[PDB]
Amino acid sequence: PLIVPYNLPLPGGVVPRMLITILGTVKPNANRIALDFQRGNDVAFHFNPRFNENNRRVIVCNTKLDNNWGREERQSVFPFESGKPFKIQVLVEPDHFKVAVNDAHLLQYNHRVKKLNEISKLGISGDIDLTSASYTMI
């Protein structure tokens, strides 16, 4: 297993055709999970499942620039379930990050941070038992 919060360096940033795979299990009674692709202190892509936001389950996506969050992108579809194993796959594409959960397409997030070669970290945080975090070129 891996220790959470987890820091996975992405040497030289991300590039199109780069596939990142996170394997884990959501804790029972989980409240939140967050993936943070970072460009220094900026968060290029924050992918944040929320298990209880006003008693609803929602995925919140955003970008943080100079310490300020931007305009959120919300997804009704919520594939996660407390206490169950999951797989998140983030495929870096020319115009967006493509997220699939448990082999099902979930969302696309357009690149607001254009310097892909500077998004050199993925942080993994939240109410999970983290099993594996890696990348490969497809």
Ligand X SMILES: CN(C(=O)[C@@H]1O[C@H](CO)[C@H](O)[C@H](n2cc(-c3cc(F)c(F)c(F)c3)nn2)[C@H]1O)c1cc(Cl)cc(Cl)c1
Residues lying near ligand X in the complex (CB under 6 A) are found at 32-34, 46, 48, 60, 62, 69, 72, 125-126
Residue 62 or 108: the one with the smaller Cβ distance to ligand X is 62
- Tell whether residue 32 is among the known ligand binding residues: no
Residue 48 or 89: the one with the smaller Cβ distance to ligand X is 48
Token pair recorded at residue 8: 């996975």
Q: How far is the CB of 24 from ligand X (least distance, A)?
A: 13
Residue 109 or 137: the one with the smaller Cβ distance to ligand X is 109
Q: How far is the CB of 69 from ligand X (least distance, A)?
A: 4
- Tell whether residue 73 is among the known ligand binding residues: yes
The 3 state secondary structure assigned to 48-110 is: EEEEEECCEEEEEEEEEECCEECCCEEECCCCCCCCCEEEEEEEECCCEEEEEECCEEEEEEE
- Tell whether residue 74 is among the known ligand binding residues: yes
Residue 43 or 91: the one with the smaller Cβ distance to ligand X is 43
According to DSSP, residue 118 is labeled: G
Ramachandran quadrant class, 64 (left: phi over 0; alpha: psi -120 to 50; beta: rest): beta
- Tell whether residue 24 is among the known ligand binding residues: no
Q: How far is the CB of 17 from ligand X (least distance, A)?
A: 28
Q: How far does CA 3 lie from the centroid of its chain?
A: 17
- Tell whether residue 108 is among the known ligand binding residues: no
DSSP letters of 6-44?
Answer: EEEE-TT---TTEEEEEEEEEPTT--BEEEEEEETTEEE
Q: How far is the CB of 53 from ligand X (least distance, A)?
A: 8
Binding site for a beta-D-galactoside, by residue number, is 69-75
